[PDB]
Structures are given as C-alpha cells and as structure tokens.
Amino acid sequence: ERFDAFICYCPSDIQFVQEMIRQLEQTNYRLKLCVSDRDVLPGTCVWSIASELIEKRCRRMVVVVSDDYLQSKECDFQTKFALSLSHQKRLIPIKYKAMKKEFPSILRFITVCDYTNPCTKSWFWTRLAKALSLP
Amino acid sequence: ERFDAFICYCPSDIQFVQEMIRQLEQTNYRLKLCVSDRDVLPGTCVWSIASELIEKRCRRMVVVVSDDYLQSKECDFQTKFALSLSHQKRLIPIKYKAMKKEFPSILRFITVCDYTNPCTKSWFWTRLAKALSLP
Amino acid sequence: ERFDAFICYCPSDIQFVQEMIRQLEQTNYRLKLCVSDRDVLPGTCVWSIASELIEKRCRRMVVVVSDDYLQSKECDFQTKFALSLSHQKRLIPIKYKAMKKEFPSILRFITVCDYTNPCTKSWFWTRLAKALSLP
Amino acid sequence: ERFDAFICYCPSDIQFVQEMIRQLEQTNYRLKLCVSDRDVLPGTCVWSIASELIEKRCRRMVVVVSDDYLQSKECDFQTKFALSLSHQKRLIPIKYKAMKKEFPSILRFITVCDYTNPCTKSWFWTRLAKALSLP
Amino acid sequence: ERFDAFICYCPSDIQFVQEMIRQLEQTNYRLKLCVSDRDVLPGTCVWSIASELIEKRCRRMVVVVSDDYLQSKECDFQTKFALSLSHQKRLIPIKYKAMKKEFPSILRFITVCDYTNPCTKSWFWTRLAKALSLP
C-alpha cells in the first residue's frame, strides 16, 4: 500500500535499478520502493498511476537521468507532473553514466547526484540513503 | 457453464494458448478458460459467442497480441466489443513475441504484460495468474 | 430522448440524409430520426452511443450503403453490433447511387430498398415510411 | 473568479479564439471564458495554472486542435493533465481548419466539433453553446 | 524613497523605458518607477544597489528582455539576485522586439508580457498596470 519513493527510469536502464534495489532494500535501511514492472498488475489504466501512486502513496520521486531518458515521453510527462505537484524535496535526479547529450534544461534548478566522478564516488550511497529516509 | 477469462487469439498462435492452459489450469491455481476450438460445438451462430459468452459467462478477457492478430477481422470485432461493453479491469493484453509491426492504437491506454524482455521474465506468470485470479 | 431510427451514413453522404430529413420529418408523417451531427453533444465517448443510442433509444437502424461506406470502420462496427442484437426487422439497408463495387456480403440476407431505378421512384418513400412507422 | 471553459490553443491561432469570444460572450448566451493572454497576470508561475485554473476554477476544457498545435509543448502537457484528471465530459476538441496531418491519436475516443464542412455549419455554434452551458 | 518596480534594461534600450514612463507615470495611473540613470546620484558604489534598492526599497522587478540584454553582466547579476531573493510573483519579464536568439532559459518558468504580436496589443498596458499595482 504505502511506499517511500516512486522511481522514474527508462526501460533500457534496468540493471542500475536492480542494483539500487539490492543496495537499499536489502541493507539494514529497510526502504520500500515502487517499480512499475514489479508491482503493477496488467490491465490497469495508465492515467491512474499518476493520480493515485505518485499523488497519495509515495513521498519522493527518483528520476534516473540518461541519454535514453531523453526520448521517452511517459517519463517526461511524469517528471512534469511531479514538478507541478509542488522543504519536502520531492524530486531526486540521479546521473550514473557518462552521458553525451546535454543535461535537460527542466532539471537545472536542482542539485543532481553524480556517480561518474572518481574522486566523489565515496559519498553517493550514503547521501542517497539519508535523502530517501528523511521524514 | 461459468468461466474465468475468455481468450482472443489468431489461429496462427495456438502453441502459446496450449502453454497458458498447461501453466494456469493444471497447476494448483485451478483456473477455467474458455477456448473457442474446445467448448463451442459446430453449427452455432457466430453472433451468439459475443452476446452470450463474453457478456454473461466469462468474467474477463485476455487478448494475445501478435503480427497475425492485426490481419484478422473477427479478433478486431471481439476486441472492440469488450471495450464497448464497459475497476474490474476486464481486458488483459499479452505480448510474447518479437513483433515487427506497431502496437495497436486502440490498446494504448492499458498496461501490457510483456514477455520479450529478458530481464523481466521472472514476474510474468505470477503477475498474470494474480490478475486473472483477482475477483 | 426517444427516437424511431438510428441513421448510419458515410460522412461524404450528407445531402441524401438532409433529403431524407426533408421528406420524412418535415412532412406530415411526423417521424423522428437521430442524426449524429445534430443530436450528439461534443465531447461524448464513442463507446457509449453503441450501447445507449442503438441499444435502448432507437428502434430501427437505417444503413445508407454507398461506395465510400466500405472505407469507414465506425459504420462497420455499428452494423455488426446491430446484427449481433437480433420478425422485428431491425435493419434497413438503403441504396441510392450507382456502385461500381460489389454489395457487402454481410447484408445479403436482407431486402434492400433500392432507389436508382427510374420507374420505382413512386414506391420508395411510401415503403420507407410504412416500414419505419411500424410498432 | 470562476469560469466555464479553459481554452487551450496554439498562439499561432488567435483569430479563431477572437471569433469564439465574439460569438459566445458578446452574444446573448452570457458565457464566461478564461483566455490565458487576457486573464493571466504576467510573472505567474507556469505550474500553478494547471493545478489551480484547469482543476479547481474552470469547469470544462476546450482544445482548439490545429496543425501548429502539434509542436507546442505546453498544450500537450495541459491536454494530458486534463485527461488524467478525468459522464461530465471535461474535454471538447474543436477543429476549424484543413489539416494535412493525422489527427492526434490521443483524441480518438472523443467526438470532435468540426467546422470546415460547408454543409453542417448551421449546428456548430448551437451544439457548442449547448455543450458549454450544461452543469 | 519608496517605489513600485525596479527596472532592469540594457543601455541600448532607452526609448522603450522612456515610453513606459510616459504611459505609466504621466498618465492617470500614478505609479512610481526607479530608473537607474535618473534617480541614482553619481559616485555610488555598485554593490549597494542590490542590497539596498532592490532588496528593501522597490517591491517588484521588471526585466526588459532584448537581444543585447544577453551581453551585459550587470543585468545577469541583478536578475539572479532577484530570483535568489524569492506566490507574490515579484518578477515580470517584458518582450517588445523581434529576437534572433532563443529566449533565456533562466526565465522560462514565468509568464512573459509579449508586445510584438499585432493582435494582443490591446491588453498589454492594462495587464502590466494591473500586475504592478497590486499590494
């Protein structure tokens, strides 16, 4: 029923989502995440996952930015809906791969979390855990 | 007498229907499925299977989408009739093959249960069975 | 509210529909016809007119068969839905123009009301009104 | 404060919006329309329009579909937001020009109010006003 | 001492701000505008304007966006300070000329007051005065 964060990812980036699941749910942090391909039964109407899950179930939303994320339209609509929804910090961008295309202009007002800098990799997961577990 | 899910499929795809029968009917789920070539005696009128079986006997409908599904007219009529009939989620599309054509525009508002993605095949049968066994 | 006959026509055939309105509605017969472009408010869902108007509002369905009638799909779905419903004679095909393509094979067990014969023009409207005015 | 219809139009088509306001507000119907370029103060945030005007202030939404409408990006978001939000028919598509592109596939379940037909122009404004004046 | 709107303009655009003075101050509106090179004594330190004039003297900030506005750095710093300072919508962008460069992405979440359209010019001054006359 209740969750802790919705996750918006392009379908071509699934290994990183699985790694996120292993690193956050299985550790002693005990976080609950909603993945569309895992706990959404077939036959549901698309226009309900935005008005029911993101609205009244999850508390944050984690956007996995990538080059392939810039071609899907469902992710774009979900990002705009999350922005138009509303201190709480209800949006967390994440970049993890060396992307060649320009960073989206919509998400330029929020501090991104980076994983491709060798001198800063030691803070990534410990920052994510507390950002997601903040009340 | 009664049933749990009418099945719509092109005759070019019957091995998958047999596999569905094996997986859903002969397991401890104990489901009942209505197949046209197995529960319809010859000599019946075509215009009765739509107004009697899909409406007053079957409780949901499962549509097996494929490239040969687009070439048949009977399946198109049976698809449109189900939508015209009417929370209950009385329509479940299924994609199981590497199709080279475009997904039908009529069924673009319903979540599909995909089988061709190798990283998500571990949830297919369980999700399908839960959806079909939902009251 | 209540009508006497739903009208199924190609959008390229509107002059004949207007002529039918003039000859049957504005005459002393005082019949009622439900034309889509005159009695349907904008913004309605397509799958409601088939289960509300054709089902429980109109009593008969008049199909204006023409060459371009074979291209539209809404007319095909409406014709098949009307046939699936059922001595009452709840379907009247009307031919008014010379066709260079074969008459539809689904409408071959029904007596069409031909108009193009230059000697039977006197019986056309009388037969049509007598058929429509039956209880 | 309150309105009756939020109008979604491409900024390349303002003459038809002026015609609409002339024929519906300055006439004896006494309707109220919320035009962005007339009733929105400068310096407002974009994300408040969707969540305050379209949802809780206006009562219906009228989409002026055209060829240049397909390239604007805020119109798509507004249309999808309205669709996700919602018998009351909170959407009315209006076509007034000769389009050489395909009609938007997201709007294929709704009856459009066409204007380019030189025969049915008599019912256009009557149907539009009757639709807008409903509670 | 007190004002109503600080004005940020490129020095290449002085005719338009003179016209703005002519239309809003000398008219019957009775509004006060703080022009940079008309109400500031020479010899003042630059870093006091942002912390004293924009911060605690004016109430809103108007930005005359133009092609040469993208060259000056003082305008960039003033715009960024205004944005970092703060619902109450204390930032109004004004476009009045044909630009050959893309509109700045910093000011994309707010509604510009366009003037170059030859049809909406009627509402321009009324909207501007109503916007900046609010408490």
Place this chain on the structure above:
Amino acid sequence: ERFDAFICYCPSDIQFVQEMIRQLEQTNYRLKLCVSDRDVLPGTCVWSIASELIEKRCRRMVVVVSDDYLQSKECDFQTKFALSLSHQKRLIPIKYKAMKKEFPSILRFITVCDYTNPCTKSWFWTRLAKALSLP
C-alpha cells in the same frame, strides 16, 4: 550546522581541496569547513545555498583561483554575491599553481595568498590558518 568558511572551487581541481581539508581539519587547529559535494543533500534548491549557507551559517569565504575557475558561472555568481554581502575580511583568494591567464579584475583589490613562488612557501599554511581562526 555552524561553520567557519565556505569553499568555492571548480570541480576540475579537488585534490587541493582534499589537501586543505587534511591540513586544516585533522590537525590541532580543529577547523570545520563546508564542502558542497560532502554535506549538501541531493534534491535541494540551488538558490538556497547562497541565501542560507553563505549568509547565516559560514563566517568567511575562501576562493580557490585557477584557470578553470574563470570558466564556471556558478562560482562567479557566488563570489559576486559574497562581495555584495559586505574589518571582518570575509573573502580569501588562494593561488596554488602557475596560471597562464590574467588574474580576475574583480579580486584585484584584496591581498591573495600565493603558493607558486618558491621563496615564501614556508609562510603559507600558518598564515592562511591564522586568518581563518580569527574571531
């Protein structure tokens, strides 16, 4: 919470920042600095790290000047904001390597702490830390 100095650096030179942390924090001086990539949770708004951290938390600001520092706009805005903010000596420029580009003219009115000249490097760290430890 409370800090002693805000550090402004380009991402291209973080090894010097690591060395500065080692030399000033882990010694007997026991200073505490603020690094963006270390104690700034993701999802926070950019326009608050300037109006909340630099103003109400830190007491002074260290600026690491190099060739790559002249290419980043965020550092330029931060140093201009700090300069506009204000005996306290709330700005300390640090030169640590041979730069072949001209020194910025904004900072040409403040004594810099130099590390390149191989005759005063014995006067560097104690002199730098005495400034930061001042009340």
Place this chain on the structure above:
Amino acid sequence: ERFDAFICYCPSDIQFVQEMIRQLEQTNYRLKLCVSDRDVLPGTCVWSIASELIEKRCRRMVVVVSDDYLQSKECDFQTKFALSLSHQKRLIPIKYKAMKKEFPSILRFITVCDYTNPCTKSWFWTRLAKALSLP
C-alpha cells in the same frame, strides 16, 4: 439618472472615447459619463437627447474636436445648443491628434486642453480630471 459630462464625438474616433472611459472611471476618480452608443435605447426620438440629456441631466459637455468632427451635422447642432444654454464652464474642447485643417472658429474663445504637444502631455489627464470633477 444623473451624470457628470456629455460627450460629443464623431463616430470615426471611438478608441479615444474608450481611453477616456478607462482613464476617467476605472480609477479612484469614480466619474460618470453618458455615451450615446451605450446609454441610449433604440427607438428614441432624436429631439429628446438635446432637451432632456444635455439640459437637465448632464452638468458639462466635452467635445472631442477632430478633422472628421467638421463633417457631421449633428455635432454642430449639439455644440450650438450647448452654447445657447449659456463661470460654470459648461464646455470643454479636447484636441488629441494632428489636424491638417484650421481649428473651428466658434470654439476660439475657449482654452483647449491640447494633447499633441510632446512637452506638455504630462499635465493632460491630471488637468482634465480636475476640470471635470470641479463642481
């Protein structure tokens, strides 16, 4: 019932009358003006708007002098009737645009309120409003 000023204008210049409305009774002045095309019901006799409105209802009369004002024959009669009526200053000529023809001779003994001189437009509205509001 009561009024404050009758307005004599040729139909060719109504935009200036709209501007006068906006600047005179949309502000805190709260004036009342009698416009023929807004306060005269159809079917009235022409000879009553002179002996009823100008005489016993309005307190003053403003004449929008223009080049086209010398073509209409009703304005001459209205002006001469006002003059024949009568300190109270019951006539205010107003000149706003350049004229290629001499000023009317009948109106030579009265000081006009000029608007076309670029050095004196700062007094126009504030003087005209005081004149109209004077008892």
